């Protein structure tokens, strides 16, 4: 019933600005204070700011005062976070959230949106086949930025035996990942295996047929 749908994440360079949206539904929007909370691997959770849409007042965490701005659009039941003067350290997944009433703990949460702040340029991936009882074959998804990519097999028809490994940041500031599917050795002559790599940040999809050696 209560839903918070966020949008607006992406890559932005240091000093840039970005605005995030939280579309709310299933409750009287103005009856509750709302919040932003960010998450980063190895940095845990940080409350960012709240807005009382009844008083029109908002309050910011010390690190973000003077550079982040909340606002609301009642007609659309939508909450915004405007981020200015972003630094690399602001890289994080941003969530919108709601207070039950007067206390600042959070019952409903948005799905989250990744904001990456980096001076590094968007780069689409290089996709290489990893040529193969059962056989393991894969694709190497190499030298891309920023996260995420998604990998499917045979247009998403093949899900069993698939294992996509987490992306690994090289010291070149680029990411690489691999996805392996384990299939019957007997399949290798008759069945076609195509990995489907989607890199939304560069608006690039790459499909690569994996052939025996």
């Amino acid at each position: 019933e209560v839903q918070l749908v966020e949008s607006g994440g992406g890559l932005v360079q240091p000093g840039g600005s970005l605005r995030l949206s939280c579309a709310a539904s299933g409750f009287t929007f103005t009856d509750y204070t709302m919040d932003w909370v960010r998450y980063a691997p190895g940095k845990g959770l940080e409350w960012v700011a709240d807005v009382n849409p009844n008083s029109g007042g908002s309050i910011y965490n010390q690190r973000f005062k003077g550079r982040f701005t909340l606002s609301v659009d009642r007609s659309k039941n939508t909450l915004y976070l405007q981020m200015n003067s972003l630094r690399a350290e602001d890289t994080a997944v941003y969530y919108c959230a709601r207070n039950l009433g007067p206390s600042f703990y959070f019952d409903y949460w948005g799905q989250g949106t990744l904001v990456t702040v980096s001076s590094a340029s968007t780069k689409g991936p290089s996709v290489f086949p990893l040529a193969p009882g059962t056989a393991a074959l894969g694709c190497l998804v190499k030298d891309y930025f920023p996260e995420p990519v998604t990998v499917s097999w045979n247009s998403g028809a093949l899900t069993s035996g698939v294992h996509t490994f987490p992306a690994v940041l090289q010291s070149s500031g680029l990411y690489s990942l691999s996805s392996v599917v384990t299939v019957p050795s007997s399949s290798l002559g008759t069945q076609t295996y195509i990995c489907n790599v989607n890199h939304k940040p560069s608006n690039t999809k790459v499909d690569k047929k994996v052939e025996p050696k």
Partner: protein, 207 residues
């Protein structure tokens, strides 16, 4: 300003166990403490508020206690869907600070060797005047592993890598970039993966 310190940082546990996580506040925050469960890539999920009240729909095996500075989350009998990271949060006073999290990890098989899979450069990458060795690692336990790379039997590089749980086992990978002449001219290359008293080394050769 108010610090929230959880402990342990992580723990390994098995289905059916009693888990007890600790949160200490740097000052008096009264009864104003919430607990959340966070799964990877997922929103935090509210469990406990007011230090000891179960939120709607939260299984009874979850319970909190404490007042002032000392708080406890307790899971009476750990269920399969309960491995996650649990965060305490004070909402007593601004800025509503969170604890750093406590990872609750599947115990698995702590003395198992790492499973290692090693793919050589493809002819496609070699033709793009480049080449990559791909070492994939699947472990029945949460701990970090060490990865060392070898050209023939000489070390190339070596680092410690943390694994992460997967959509179950824990996964990691490591990559070694080479010139095509490097790959063609050596008898072989090797990825060697060590966890505690176990090492697994996989070797590939230009063929």
């Amino acid at each position: 300003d108010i610090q929230m310190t959880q402990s342990p940082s992580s723990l390994s546990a098995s289905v059916g166990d009693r888990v007890t996580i600790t949160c200490k506040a740097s000052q008096d925050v009264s009864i104003g403490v919430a607990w959340y469960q966070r799964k990877p890539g997922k929103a935090p999920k509210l469990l406990i508020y007011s230090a000891s009240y179960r939120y709607t729909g939260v299984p009874s095996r979850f319970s909190g206690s404490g007042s002032g500075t000392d708080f406890t989350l307790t899971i009476s009998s750990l269920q399969p869907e309960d491995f996650a990271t649990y965060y305490c949060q004070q909402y007593y006073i601004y800025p509503y600070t969170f604890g750093q999290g406590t990872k609750v990890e599947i115990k698995g098989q702590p003395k198992a060797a790492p499973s290692v899979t090693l793919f050589p450069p493809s002819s496609e990458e070699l033709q793009a005047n480049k080449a990559t060795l791909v070492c994939l690692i699947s472990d029945f336990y949460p701990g970090a592993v060490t990865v060392a790379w070898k050209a023939d039997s000489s070390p190339v590089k070596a680092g410690v890598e943390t694994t992460t749980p997967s959509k179950n086992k824990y996964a990691a990978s490591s990559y070694l970039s080479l010139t095509p002449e490097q790959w063609k001219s050596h008898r072989s290359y090797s990825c060697q993966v060590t966890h505690e008293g176990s090492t697994v080394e996989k070797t590939v050769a230009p063929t």
